[PDB]
Write a protein that binds this ligand. Structure first.
Ligand SMILES: CCCCC/C=C\C\C=C/C=C\C=C/[C@@H](SC[C@H](NC(=O)CC[C@H](N)C(=O)O)C(=O)NCC(=O)O)[C@@H](O)CCCC(=O)O
Length: 1332
């Protein structure tokens, strides 16, 4: 009377036995709350949130828990008033009920608004009660009424448990306040999604993070663990175990998900067996159908809990890594600073942290993928037998083959990356010197130079396309690669074996499962190798030696005290300052004096605890303001540069700004002091950078100032003014202890104390007059001296219509072939079993041929698609480059250089890497979903009525997801860049920050910048889970209906038709979610194509008109004639009617604001003539093509910008002039001695802008360019080597006509026929003799 099959599996009324009802159905819920409870105290204790108040809901639940216990014990009372189960079961139920009410009580105490255990437990109890209820109502007072009361109370308790209790910024994330049901299905983001449909998302209306995802909590925890280990020993992975306890729930969730996923094919086997057998009740089939849907729903909920936990752990890992690296960068010693690069360190933060999030999502595969394949193997084995091994051998041949590919893809990126940077380093060199480049027609040469690098880069992309082809091939047809071999061996080995519907289709479903773990595991292994590579970098960085923090005694308010102190720049390097001793009293001006490399700047570095103190005692008293030699400028506005995170005082600020003589600099700058100075914003001259640095130090109002050569780049008058109003005894810092490093004698007599040193050693310090009287070292020193479809059509044109249509045809052929192969397997399964099947050889051969066609087609579209991607990228980059180069300088000056150089990099990276792969994934998923839907209706046509409900809801999520995700996927991208770009700045001014003691402010700044990025990132990773849960639920509904419609119509179809319909239904779930994701990725990445075709409407005079082309000797004499010239800019140039005769030296004089320089722009047609007819000799300029005239006229600009490469490519990019001409021109440019000195001869590799070369040399190289050009018309733009360049321009260019715009009248006096420009008009036209 406990368990039989007659009343439970062979009867049309599926009733449970009486004993089963009273034993197992009651042991399930009571025992469910018994194994988790002891484990629930762990969570309830470790995690606390206060206590919830006394509410009616909490009490209602507690009172019903008391009554429920009574009712269950009331049964024991009546039993006490024969059957053994009538004693233990009621008491056990009462006791577990007493545990339930105690649990809601303690959950109130521990502050859990919504409970998961107190919901699943009631759900399980309800289902058990429902089963007994149905049985008890089918049986029909004494003990039944107690059960009805129990069931009603349990139902009301379950309904109550759904509501969220009262709680223990104006925009907190609803993560914490959401109930259990909302947390399971991620419903709390729905509003944020739906708002994303009408109200465009902004960084302000974004949620704030939780307390578990903020830098202030995640970073100090990892820092403490890192400190504990170092002192304990310093290994690293040991520390990452801290994330383990949280990451541990991922283990349980993945373990549950694996079994839940494998419960699918078993139910499919049961269903196929049911359809095969005629003598079976319909309720049996309905049971399997409902069980499959329940299993799928539990699987998806568990999987998306696992994924969310895994993603949150990775985000925390990134946050902790960023925080730890930033906090360490402020403490590492000098040698460690130089051990890396301000560049590599930033790249370490940018790459290692991202790799950790990238790894986290699939690190669990190392233990899950093996189980997800091994368990399938055993299921396949018991289904088929030994023939499985012959299949798995192919699986063996798949892992290494797939791994080597993942090995190649790992390395090819490197060969691509170094090729990309080499391009992007060159493009800036083009963009910085665009005017000089387009002054004498270097557009083509540099275009070809860039295109060569582009081709070298595209070779690697072609190789990566060939690799990704095999990768996709394996991913797509690994299931069938296994299936064909396994079925062939199974049929061939033995004649007696019969392949029915259940074997073939359950094995096919199992292979569909095997597909994922097989092809993800090598990718996980490669990612682990990369992460372990990055771990070594993080180890060697975090383990760096921090500089002694107490080396310098910083006593709060004899001002500076040094006795017998020797300092080093490294532990093993020799001392730089040997045995220094000096006492600087309060409010005294001390000047450090020495030669180059003496040790002056080292003294100020040592007073800031930047040098490594090998011995001594330093007692700097009070706050220190450091003015470094190399000025550190924050990208913030000039006002905040001077303020330096300090309260603004209008009177003090306005006293500081002009005392540094920053008023003219404020005037020239556009926005004044609100202008964005720094590398990214407006560039500033060195002297201006010094003034701002000094102004910042003066505003900081310290007592001790360390001025490491503040007046190096300021002019003599500006320097004297600054010293008078700032550093001098009658300036701003009169009472401040100033210690200045100088090599200028002009202010030395005003200094109170002069510390003169030699070779890092104190050498007879003293006051100026006393030192002069002593006549020693100081005397010697003094004596020394919604995307539109048009974008998609444009991209498909860029690929090429033939390639695009061929790729589309090959997908259709691949997917039709796969569908036909599966249908053929379905026909094979249900064949006359005439003892076995006789079509075996024929059907096996046909199935093999279809699969070979499938594989050949798959490798086909990828190759076409992948090659089409390369073709489109090549054409897009070429078009962009041609449009930019042909564009006038007005674009360059109007559009920011940063925005333009963004597309030359990010857009090309997107088109080169992301777009083709996303198209492949999107179209593969779309065709798989369409094919599965097609098969569903082929097997069950009545499933068409299920389309409208799903097709509506699928329409909504698809409409709600992409409209919102594109915002977040953008909001994150624009927010992660300010993080690293901040760190770089912090890395440039570590010494300044430590001197001002502003570590904490920058720590908070970095924490805030990381938190903003996380705020942008977390909603996206929750939107992924939201979308996936919705679409997986849709897929589970479609599997439910597809199985149900086969069950109801099992007398018209075959288990094979069922086997195929349900098997494809199981595939629909994992493909709908990826289809919508890939639609989102397409709608986000295809905008890059629009950004690339933006400059399509490139606009300058067509080069080489070839219709009015001039003769070879166009400047026959060089007769220039400005005939009523007017230059628009309202008119800078106006009423210009001048004539410069051939071979007549002519200069242009004028003040700032005149049309002097603009006149040169007129000669080279930089700006089109608003009204003018400039004619050289007998030919109009406006008619001639640009290149022609730009080649026949030469210019020596203000600052010659030398381009990266060899000197010969600088002189002659086209290599048109012979080597003898280059040598002669270089000799004639007073450069033969220097140019012969480089070991590379003419191939000297000059860096960006010729940093290695001096300014004089670069000027002479530009003169050499002009001389090598050998043209009759030459223009000069004048600002030490002036004597040399002036003599050289006066030496052999007397034959040629030279215009000269000089800000100095001394040189212009030599040139006859001076033209003076007052405000664009010709004020005077005649020789300098007539001028005076
Ligand atoms: C892509 C292969 C090359 C191209 C092949 C051509 C066409 C293939 C057809 C369909 C494409 C996609 C199929 C399934 C997704 S499936 C998405 C993936 N897997 C799961 O959803 C986990 C479920 C799985 N069954 C398991 O074992 O847990 C995942 O981790 N999602 C995380 C998230 O939600 O963000 C995988 O591609 C994701 C892996 C992508 C990757 O890391 O390269």
């Amino acid at each position: 009377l406990f368990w039989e099959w007659n009343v439970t599996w062979n009867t049309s009324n599926p009733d449970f036995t009486k004993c089963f009802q009273n034993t197992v159905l009651v042991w399930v819920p009571c025992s469910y709350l018994w194994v988790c409870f002891p484990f629930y105290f762990l969570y309830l204790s470790h995690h606390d949130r206060g206590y919830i108040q006394m509410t009616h809901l909490n009490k209602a639940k507690t009172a019903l828990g008391f009554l429920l216990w009574i009712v269950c014990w009331a049964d024991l009372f009546y039993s006490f008033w024969l059957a053994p189960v009538f004693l233990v079961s009621p008491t056990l139920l009462g006791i577990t009920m007493l545990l339930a009410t105690f649990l809601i009580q303690i959950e109130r105490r521990r502050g859990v608004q919504s409970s998961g255990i107190m919901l699943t437990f009631w759900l399980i109890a309800l289902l058990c009660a429902l089963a007994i209820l149905r049985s008890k109502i089918m049986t029909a007072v004494f003990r039944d009424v107690t059960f009805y009361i129990y069931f009603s109370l349990v139902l009301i308790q379950l309904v109550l448990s759904c509501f969220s209790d009262r709680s223990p910024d104006p925009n907190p994330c609803p993560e914490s306040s959401a109930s259990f049901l909302s947390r399971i299905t991620f419903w709390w983001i729905t509003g944020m999604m739906v708002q994303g449909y009408r109200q465009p998302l902004e960084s302000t209306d974004l949620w704030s993070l939780n307390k578990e995802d903020t830098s202030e909590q995640v970073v100090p925890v990892l820092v403490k663990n890192w400190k504990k280990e170092c002192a304990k020993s310093s290994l690293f992975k040991v520390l990452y175990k801290t994330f383990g306890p949280y990451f541990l729930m991922s283990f349980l969730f993945k373990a549950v998900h694996d079994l839940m996923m494998f419960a699918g094919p078993e139910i499919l086997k049961l269903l196929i067996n049911f359809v095969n057998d005629k003598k079976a009740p319909e309720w049996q089939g309905y049971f399997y159908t409902a069980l499959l849907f329940i299993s799928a729903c539990l699987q998806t909920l568990v999987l998306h809990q696992y994924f969310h936990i895994c993603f949150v752990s990775g985000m925390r890992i990134k946050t902790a890594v960023i925080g730890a690296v930033y906090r360490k960068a402020l403490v590492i010693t000098n040698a460690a600073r130089k051990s890396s690069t301000v560049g590599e360190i930033v790249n370490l933060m940018s790459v290692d942290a991202q790799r950790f999030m990238d790894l986290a999502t699939y690190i669990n595969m190392i233990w899950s993928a093996p189980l997800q394949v091994i368990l399938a193997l055993y299921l396949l084995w018991l289904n088929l037998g030994p023939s499985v091994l012959a299949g798995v051998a192919v699986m063996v041949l798949m892992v290494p083959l797939n791994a080597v590919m993942a090995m190649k893809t790992k390395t090819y990126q490197v060969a691509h990356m170094k090729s990309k940077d080499n391009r992007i380093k060159l493009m800036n060199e083009i963009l910085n010197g665009i005017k000089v480049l387009k002054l004498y027609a270097w557009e083509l040469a540099f275009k070809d130079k860039v295109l060569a690098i582009r081709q070298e880069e595209l070779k690697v992309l072609k190789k990566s396309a060939y690799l990704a082809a095999v990768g996709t091939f394996t991913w797509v047809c690994t299931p069938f690669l296994v299936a064909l071999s396994t079925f062939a061996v199974y049929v061939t080995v033995d004649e007696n074996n019969i392949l029915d519907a259940q074997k073939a289709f359950v094995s096919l479903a199992l292979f569909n499962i095997l597909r994922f773990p097989l092809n993800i595991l090598p990718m996980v292994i490669s990612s682990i190798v990369q992460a372990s590579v990055s771990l070594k970098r993080l180890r060697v960085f975090l383990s760096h030696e921090d500089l002694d923090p107490d080396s310098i005694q910083r006593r709060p308010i004899n001002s500076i005290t040094v006795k017998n102190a020797t300092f080093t720049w490294a532990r093993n390097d020799p001392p730089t300052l040997h045995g220094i001793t000096f006492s600087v009293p309060e409010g005294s001006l001390v000047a450090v004096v020495g030669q180059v490399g003496c040790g002056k700047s080292s003294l100020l570095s040592a007073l800031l605890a930047e040098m490594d103190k090998v011995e001594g005692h330093v007692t700097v008293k009070g706050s220190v303001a450091y003015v470094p030699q190399q000025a550190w400028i924050q990208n913030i506005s000039l006002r905040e540069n001077i303020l330096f995170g300090r309260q603004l005082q209008e009177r003090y600020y306005k006293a500081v700004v002009e005392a540094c003589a920053l008023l003219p600099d404020l005037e020239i700058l556009p926005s004044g002091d609100r202008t964005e100075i720094g590398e990214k914003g407006v560039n500033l001259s060195g002297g201006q950078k010094q003034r701002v640095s000094l102004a910042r130090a003066v505003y900081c109002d310290s007592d001790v100032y360390l001025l490491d050569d503040p007046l190096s780049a300021v002019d003599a008058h500006v320097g004297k003014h600054i010293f008078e109003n700032v550093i001098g005894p009658k300036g701003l810092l009169k009472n401040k202890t100033r210690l200045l490093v100088t090599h200028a004698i002009s202010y030395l007599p005003q200094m109170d104390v002069i510390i003169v040193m030699s070779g890092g050693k104190i050498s007879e310090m003293g006051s100026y007059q006393e030192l002069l009287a002593r006549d020693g070292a100081f005397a010697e020193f003094l004596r020394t001296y919604q995307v539109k479809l048009s974008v998609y059509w444009d991209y498909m044109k860029a690929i090429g219509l033939f390639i695009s249509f061929l790729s589309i045809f090959l997908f259709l052929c691949n997917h039709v072939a796969s569908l036909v192969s599966n249908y053929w397997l379905s026909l094979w399964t249900d064949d006359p079993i005439v003892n076995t099947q006789e079509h075996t050889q024929v059907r096996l051969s046909v199935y093999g041929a279809l699969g070979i066609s499938q594989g050949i087609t798959v490798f086909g579209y990828s190759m076409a698609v992948s090659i089409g991607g390369i073709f489109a990228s090549r054409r897009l980059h070429l078009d962009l480059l041609h449009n930019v180069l042909r564009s006038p300088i007005s674009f360059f000056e109007r559009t920011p250089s940063g925005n333009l150089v963004n597309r030359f990099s990010k857009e090309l990276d997107t088109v080169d890497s992301m777009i083709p792969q996303v198209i492949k994934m999107f179209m593969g998923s779309l065709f798989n979903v369409i094919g599965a839907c097609i098969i569903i209706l082929l097997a069950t046509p009545m499933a068409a009525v299920i389309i409208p409900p799903l097709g509506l809801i699928y329409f909504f999520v698809q409409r709600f997801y992409v409209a919102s995700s594109r915002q977040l996927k953008r909001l994150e991208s624009v927010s992660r860049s300010p993080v690293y770009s901040h760190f770089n700045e912090t890395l440039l001014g570590v010494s300044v920050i430590r001197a001002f003691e502003e570590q904490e402010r920058f720590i908070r700044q970095s924490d805030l910048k990381v938190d903003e990025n996380q705020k942008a990132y977390y909603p996206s990773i929750v939107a992924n889970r939201w979308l996936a849960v919705r679409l997986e639920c849709v897929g589970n509904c479609i599997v439910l209906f597809a199985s149900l419609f086969a069950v109801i119509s099992r007398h018209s179809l075959s288990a094979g038709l069922v086997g195929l319909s349900v098997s494809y239904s199981l595939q629909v779930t994992t493909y709908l979610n990826w289809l919508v994701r890939m639609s989102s990725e397409m709608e986000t990445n295809i905008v890059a194509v629009e950004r690339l075709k933006e400059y399509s409407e490139e606009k300058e005079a067509p080069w080489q008109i070839q219709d009015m082309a001039p003769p070879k000797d166009w400047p026959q004499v060089g007769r220039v004639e400005f005939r009523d010239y007017g230059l628009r800019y309202d008119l800078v140039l106006k009423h210009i009617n001048v004539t410069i005769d051939g071979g007549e030296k002519v200069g242009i004089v004028g003040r700032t604001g005149a049309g002097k320089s603009s006149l040169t722009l007129g000669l080279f047609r930089i700006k089109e003539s608003a009204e003018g007819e400039i004619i050289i000799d007998d030919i109009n300029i406006a008619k001639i093509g640009l290149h022609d005239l730009r080649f026949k006229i030469t210019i020596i600009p203000q600052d010659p910008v030398l381009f990266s490469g060899s000197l010969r490519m600088n002189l002659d990019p086209f290599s048109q002039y012979s080597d003898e001409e280059v040598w002669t021109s270089l000799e004639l440019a007073h450069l033969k001695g220097f140019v012969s000195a480089l070991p590379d001869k003419l191939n000297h590799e000059c860096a960006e802008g010729g940093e290695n070369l001096s300014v004089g040399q670069r000027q002479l190289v530009c003169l050499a360019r002009a001389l090598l050009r050998k043209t009759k018309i030459l223009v000069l733009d004048e600002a030490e080597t002036d004597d040399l360049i002036q003599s050289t321009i006066r030496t052999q260019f007397d034959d040629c006509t030279v215009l000269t715009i000089a800000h100095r009248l001394n040189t212009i006096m030599d040139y006859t026929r001076v033209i003076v420009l007052d405000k664009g008009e010709i004020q005077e036209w005649g020789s300098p003799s007539d001028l005076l």
